[PDB]
Structure formats: C-alpha cells, structure tokens
Design an enzyme around this catalytic site. Structure first.
Site, PDB file in Angstrom:
ATOM      1  N   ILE A 136      -3.895  28.026  31.337  1.00  0.00           N
ATOM      2  CA  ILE A 136      -4.265  26.950  30.419  1.00  0.00           C
ATOM      3  C   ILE A 136      -4.777  27.563  29.110  1.00  0.00           C
ATOM      4  CG2 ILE A 136      -5.702  24.884  30.095  1.00  0.00           C
ATOM      5  CD1 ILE A 136      -3.644  24.799  32.479  1.00  0.00           C
ATOM      6  N   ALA A 185     -13.041  33.652  45.975  1.00  0.00           N
ATOM      7  CA  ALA A 185     -13.894  32.499  45.738  1.00  0.00           C
ATOM      8  C   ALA A 185     -13.120  31.197  45.663  1.00  0.00           C
ATOM      9  CB  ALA A 185     -14.701  32.692  44.469  1.00  0.00           C
ATOM     10  N   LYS A 186     -12.020  31.197  44.915  1.00  0.00           N
ATOM     11  CA  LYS A 186     -11.262  29.967  44.719  1.00  0.00           C
ATOM     12  C   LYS A 186     -10.619  29.512  46.021  1.00  0.00           C
ATOM     13  CE  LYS A 186     -11.797  29.298  40.216  1.00  0.00           C
ATOM     14  NZ  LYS A 186     -12.711  28.247  39.709  1.00  0.00           N
ATOM     15  N   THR A 193     -25.284  26.343  30.406  1.00  0.00           N
ATOM     16  CA  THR A 193     -26.322  27.275  30.815  1.00  0.00           C
ATOM     17  C   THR A 193     -27.478  27.302  29.815  1.00  0.00           C
ATOM     18  OG1 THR A 193     -25.216  29.190  29.791  1.00  0.00           O
ATOM     19  CG2 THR A 193     -24.700  28.730  32.079  1.00  0.00           C
ATOM     20  N   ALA A 225     -19.459  21.938  30.899  1.00  0.00           N
ATOM     21  CA  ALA A 225     -18.737  21.012  30.028  1.00  0.00           C
ATOM     22  C   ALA A 225     -18.771  21.347  28.536  1.00  0.00           C
ATOM     23  CB  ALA A 225     -19.251  19.601  30.259  1.00  0.00           C
ATOM     24  N   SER A 226     -19.166  22.563  28.157  1.00  0.00           N
ATOM     25  CA  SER A 226     -19.286  22.897  26.720  1.00  0.00           C
ATOM     26  C   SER A 226     -17.958  22.970  25.971  1.00  0.00           C
ATOM     27  CB  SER A 226     -20.017  24.247  26.509  1.00  0.00           C
ATOM     28  OG  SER A 226     -21.335  24.161  26.938  1.00  0.00           O
ATOM     29  N   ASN A 262     -16.815  22.546  37.833  1.00  0.00           N
ATOM     30  CA  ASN A 262     -15.949  23.237  36.879  1.00  0.00           C
ATOM     31  C   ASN A 262     -16.443  24.583  36.397  1.00  0.00           C
ATOM     32  OD1 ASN A 262     -13.656  23.201  34.731  1.00  0.00           O
ATOM     33  ND2 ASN A 262     -15.547  23.410  33.531  1.00  0.00           N
ATOM     34  N   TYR A 317     -12.286  36.688  42.265  1.00  0.00           N
ATOM     35  CA  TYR A 317     -11.995  35.348  41.771  1.00  0.00           C
ATOM     36  C   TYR A 317     -11.085  34.589  42.765  1.00  0.00           C
ATOM     37  CZ  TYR A 317     -10.610  31.913  38.201  1.00  0.00           C
ATOM     38  OH  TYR A 317     -10.323  30.769  37.498  1.00  0.00           O
ATOM     39  N   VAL A 367     -26.377  26.956  37.898  1.00  0.00           N
ATOM     40  CA  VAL A 367     -25.663  26.556  39.124  1.00  0.00           C
ATOM     41  C   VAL A 367     -25.917  27.504  40.307  1.00  0.00           C
TER      42      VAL A 367
END
EC number: 1.1.1.100
Lengths: 248, 248, 248, 248
Positions: free
Chosen positions: A188, A158-159, A41, A17-18, A90, A155, A64
C-alpha cells in the site's frame, strides 16, 4: 445517509490513526456515521487526530504495550461516548532483518507491539461487546502473515499469530454477536513505501498483478465493510486486499 | 446517493436472480445504482424479475449451458444498456448423493451448470471489460468448495474448480483493471433450507458458531462490496460468509 | 537399512523428547539412522532420554526460554556429535482459558515457550546449516494454529505465528538447501488426552472423521518424512495430520 | 525390508506411468513392496511399463475417459492381484491458452481427462476399499490448482476441482479407513519442462526459492509416504512439493 453500511450509533476505536491506513480508516468510519476515537503515541499526534475528526470524534494518546494507558483510554471513551462497539487494531511496527542479523529486541518489540497488544486491547473491549451481544474487532494484518517474507520473519510471525488469535476469539464470541476478522493489505502507498528507491518499488510491483500499489482508502473500505451491520455473518475471516500478490 | 459504494453507471448481469441469494444480489446492486439484468431459465421467470426491478433493470431468460442463449442475451444487453461491467455468477444446482450412489448424469449436470457455465459466461463478458480496463466478475460459491461435504462431492468439485478458474483468470486480467473473485456462503436461509427437517437444521446449525443461518441479504452485501470501485485492489480472493462454520 | 528415508550421518535435536510425540519422534529418527539428542526440562528427564536412546544418542536438559542453556546445549552437541542437521521444535505447553479469564502470564508463557523459543533455537542452528548448504527445521504445530479453538486463543496465536515464521524463514534459506516446515497434529493420544473424561473425548472424537485419536508414532512418521533427503523440495509447508478434523 | 513405510501386500494402480512423475511413482511403490499396475493409453505403452516393473507388477492399457476400459482393467487386476488398495491418479493433460483464446474443446478435454476421470476411477475402486476398511487414493495435482496460473485456467479449474472432490470423499470414507489426499507438485523436471526455452525456464525458476526444478523422484517420495500405513491419520490433505513456489 441511507441505512446501507451505516455506523451511526457505533463508537469506534482505531489505533495508530495519525497517517496512512489508520487515518484513512478513522476518516471513513466517521464518514459512515461512527463516533471515532483515533490514537497516537504522542499528545501532539493525538491533537492532530482531534483536529481532523472534529465533531465526529477525538484523538487520544495510547501506548498499546502498556496496561494502564489502555485502562485510562477506555475509561475516557466509555465516559464521553459510551463503550467501544468497533475496535480496529491498526497500530503496528516493523523491525526488519534477515534472521542471522535479527536482534532479540527486534523480535520482542514486534511480538509486543504487533501481537500481544492485540490480545490486550481485544480482551479489554470484549466484556462490553458481549454484554450488548454486538461488536466488531477488526485487525489490520498484512499479506506477509500469509505469504511469509524474507527479512520479516518477526513481522510475519506476529501477523500470522493475530490470525490464529482471531479465529479462536471468533469461535469464543460468535454466539454472542461479536465478529472478529482480519483485513490483510498488500503493498500500500504510504510515506514508508514512498521512501523506497525505484528498483525496490519496481521489484515489489513486479509481484503485484494489479501493477500498482494499493491506496490506504482501499484498506479503509474493507475495514468499514467488516465493521458494518451487513457483515454480521463474517467472522474468523481474513480479507485479502493485495492486488493479486497472493491468492488463497 | 453518496460516492461511497456507488454503482451508478455500471451494468450488472446476475444469473439466477428469481429468488433467494440471486434476487437479494440483484435488488442490492439496483439499490446502489447499477442497471441490473437478472436472469431465469424461463420467460415467466424473466418477467417476474422485470417486475421487481422496474426502472432499474430487467429480467431475461438465459440458458447458462447453451452458447446461443448467452450470445443472444449479451447482444440485447449491450444494445440497450451497454456492455456488462459486473458479472455475478449465481445460478447453480445441486445433485446430491454419496459417491457410491452418484450417477454419471448427476456428476455431468453439476460440471455443466456449476463450472463449465462459469467458463463460458466469464469468457463472453471479459473482452468488453478488458477494452474498458474496468470490470468485476464475482462468483457465488459455497463453503463446501473449501471444506468439502459428504454427499456433495460433485458440487464441491465444481465450486472448488470455480476458485481455481478465478485465481487463473485474476492473474490474466489484473493489470487491465478487471477483478475476479468468489463469495462463499455458508448455510443461508432460503426456501431450500426451510425445506429441511428439524434434525437436519439443528445438526447443520450445530456447526455454525454464530448459531443462526445467514440471510440472503448478507451474501448480497458481500457481492455489492466486491462489485464496488472501492474493491479495485481485491482480486483472486474468496470471501467467506459462513458465520464461522469454516475459518481460513 | 536401505537408501530410502535414511538419516545416517545426520545429527537431530528434538526438544521435549521425554514422552508422547517427542519421544516417538526421537525414537523414529534414531531408527532411521540419525544421531539424536532429545531434551527435557529436568536432569532426570534428560537421563531417561539417554536411557532409551542408548548408543544412538543422548538426553540433555534444555530450558528453551533461556539463551545460556541453548548456547551450552549446542556447544555440547557440536563437540561430541557435530553440528545439528535436523532441528525438531516439539517442546510446547498449554495455558488454556477463555479470553475473559486469560491472565497476562498465561498469554506471555505461551508466547515465550511456543513461539519465541522457536525463533531462538532456529536462529541458533541456522548458521551451521547454511554453511553446509544442508538442513531441516521441523516445527511440531497443531491443528489449532489453523482452525482456531475456543479457550486456546494463546496456543492458537503461537502455533499460527510459528507458521508465519516458518514461511518467512523458508524464503530466506531455501536457496542454501535448508528446508523449514511444520507438522500440525490433530487430536493425538497422549497421557494428557487420556486424562480427559468420557464426554470430552467423545465430543472431540465427534469432530474427527477418522473416528479415533492419532498415535504419536503417526506424527513421528510425518516428521521423519520431512527430515529425509527425499523431502528436499518441500519447504514453507504445513503437513496436517488430523484424521480429517480440518481440511485445507 | 523393515516394517517402516512398507507396502508389501498392497496392490497399487498408478495411471499414466510411462514416464516422468508416473514412472517414478510406480517404481518407488514397487521398491517399497507394492504390487504395481501402471497404465498407459496404448498397448505398446503398457508393454514398456510391464518391462520396467518385471516381477513387481505389470502394465495395462487404460482409457481414463472410458467406462468400459476402466471396468476391464479393474477386473483383470482383481483377478490376478486382488482388489486395488492404492489408487494414484497421475494421468493428466494440458491444453494451455489465455481465456480469450481458449476453445470449447480445450476446456472440455481438460475437464474430462483431469477431473471427471478422477470421479470415475475413484468411485470404481472405493467399494472394495471400504469393504476392507483400508484404502489410499492419492491424486497428483499441481501448485497451479492452489496458486492459479495465467494461460492455464482450465488446468487450474480441474486441479482445484480434484481437491474439492478429495475433501468431500475424504469426509465420506474416513471412518472406514480409506484416506484420500492430493500431492501438488511445483515445477518438476520432465521431458516437457526440458522442452521449454531458456527464458521460460529462467522466469519460472525465478519464482522458486529452492532455485531448481523438482525431481520426479521427489514427487514419488511424497506419494509413497501418503500410501504408507504410517499415513493413516492424513486425509483430505494437499501435500505441496514446490520448493517454496507457494506456501499455504
């Protein structure tokens, strides 16, 4: 304020969430009344999260890919706030390369951070949610999970795996009032996409019918929608927020 | 009354708003600040819609298979409210039968009411939306459009066709700030589903992991979400609200 | 015999070819003219594969989670037969459990054997295929990858991840004449499904419109089709062979 | 002449078999042993089909939007050959336009020719197939049915509708040994695509990872595969043959 899309009484854990999408998510969940714990982290990252959330939550350091860290963080959350009602997965990373150049560690880091972590955290919060017959697990995915992308086979794997996991978990826990869903962002605007050169941004934008990048707040809105009481009948679903980049 | 999911300043046309899902949609859009025009096939139906909407909108009689009716209704809306900003295509019918028993008229009525009407109404509202570089078209579909269902090959064909139409329209109009999406309900509690006998309801519920029927308000919530400013980066999408009956 | 679906001149590596689907695949590829190398985890298994393939190929011991084994096997194949033209990733395992009972090792074994192995083997054969501008990689997936399944969140995640990987790899190598696809079997009659009791078989069959289990030969036929010259324009695709259990 | 992918003993009706994809389909089905009846809208078209099929079948004039024509053609087929075992719905048309320029007749012609005709012909052949507990219905779709395409909202709606119809029919008839599927071609080299100018062909090719147009024979191969005894466990499926243009 109103009873609409109201998260007052819910405790939300938002990993990574940073900045960017994770920060947008944490902020909107807090705006809608959730008590939010956001993770980073590093301890300094955690403190920055504490700083922006203020009275509506706090920041914690979480690794995580590490069981003991997860155990410690959930214990602290349960003690101060009560058990997690909403988990937003996230935190993710990239380790891009064409397959012929992709190292073993680049594959495994992605599996660990982007797929296995979701197994571990989801399992760790599920017991409490099922006891309460109420819960939300929302994964932040990517259009790449559905479309594929050259140079991101790791990627993508994994998704896509997270969506397989999500559907199976959805089936397991639906009758006990826990929903499990994925939000899949397209391109994004973040610090990372702002780092791309003009030709890369143009090429990417050429594949977006909307003709712009998405805002992190747009991904946050979709996550807040699925987290809401009103989304109780949506489970095993992948909500695509990609400006028409891919249409399923 | 916050800036979140706020439809103040938008004019919404919701077809088939007399009861069930349509009425729930109209009511929630009004609750979120939209000026709502809900439609029925009869003047008495229109008046009942006027009655529940009060100062937040009105009811009008619309024959969705008739060009002149569409023209008259949009003119009256444009005059009083301004042009339609949000179109919710909710009016549909069923003409169920196994294919070997399906009559030509049962096929053609469904195509007319459930597919061709969406072409016509969408085309009629698009010009104003594109001029403003702002618009929402939201189709109320069905899980059957994606899963198929024995005894509803006509209904399934129309719902699936609406999705094809939606993706194509989305591609045409995305760069001008108009989004086009479908919400696909599963088994929702309405007067029609309450008319089914116990064995049919049990058999249907056996295929829903959530173990209940959906509420019309849950469909309304998903439509309101896509209608919002916050959903500007979602287009060409199908949002499944089916309690896990099908997972894509 | 004819030029139709003719694999003469191609070298096929089929992992897990001792029984069931893998044996059916190896046999049909050999029938269509391929030189086939089938693998097992044990030397006795490898010899049984040598025994059924006879002059049309041979069996080798391969540990699909071990780099040195992969390196040794491909070297031996390249030396005797020439480089692999067709890779069929069929070796997989299950480690079923509801998530609250799923052990860390049950998750990781599945990721290793059912997902990471596909990365490793695909990467190891791709260089030769791209040099030749000709290749086929075909993954044997499962309906569970697309549908999800309670008690198999790990298996589902892996299978779904393989499809993400497949689409990305497809994009990377399409212009160089290599196709990458998945065949997704439903409920297929094997020794494993024959071990299920009558109530489990009936319950499973109740979800198959076809009203029977699939045969391993049916999965073999689909794999042989995608392996053929005629399937050159199919890539990034998932071919579902499930008797209508799930329809995408 | 092996037992593999052998259609000897089957009667196939292939609509729109004069050229391109339809002619390739008819020719390959005949090559694999089927008795093929290919159709055209005119008697001269029918005679040209008779001419290329020779002893392996014949051409007939069929108006696919006309019940009496369908009745007459099936009666003649039943009399000479026996009832249709394989129906390939290939006849389609385009009436391209952006939605704001799309005429009512351009919408309705497409619905009639590309969707309603599939309802009618499928229904007409299903009774015999179900009596025999054996049958194949294969629709020739398009990538546009799944992806959408600007300027083809009508064509997309019809193709997508055929898939909805296909899944529903598949559910109805699976337990009686009839499969119903769609083959969805991407950009295929035909006289029509050779009529496009260089900029259009280049722009289209830029969206195909394979970097070429498909051949009609590649579509034929996929149809022949689904028509085969070996494809008995594939139903309600959409087989994408698009060189990676879209990946589902």
């Amino acid at each position: 304020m109103s009873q609409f899309m109201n998260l007052e009484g819910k405790v939300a854990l938002v990993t990574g969430a940073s900045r960017g999408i994770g920060k947008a998510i944490a902020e909107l969940l807090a705006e809608r009344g959730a008590k939010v714990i956001g993770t980073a982290t590093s301890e300094s990252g955690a403190q920055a999260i504490s700083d922006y959330l203020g009275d509506n939550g706090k920041g914690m350091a979480l690794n995580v890919t590490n069981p003991e860290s997860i155990e410690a963080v959930l214990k602290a959350i349960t003690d101060e706030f009560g058990g997690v009602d909403i988990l937003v997965n996230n935190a993710d990373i990239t380790r891009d390369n064409l397959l012929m150049r992709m190292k073993e560690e680049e594959w495994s880091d992605i599996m660990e951070t982007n797929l296995t972590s979701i197994f571990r955290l989801s399992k760790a919060v599920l017991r409490g949610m099922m006891k309460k017959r109420q819960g939300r697990i929302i994964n932040v995915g990517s259009v790449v999970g559905t479309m594929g992308n050259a140079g991101q086979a790791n990627y993508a794997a994994a998704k896509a795996g997270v969506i397989g996991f999500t559907k199976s978990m959805a089936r397991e826990v639906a009758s006990r009032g826990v929903t499990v869903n994925t939000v899949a962002p397209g391109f994004i605007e973040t610090d990372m996409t702002k780092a791309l050169n003009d030709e890369q941004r143009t090429a990417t934008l050429a594949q977006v019918p909307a003709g712009r990048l998405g805002d992190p707040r747009e991904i946050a809105s979709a996550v807040a929608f699925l987290a809401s009481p009103e989304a109780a009948y949506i489970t095993g679903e992948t909500l695509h927020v990609n400006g028409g980049m891919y249409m399923i």
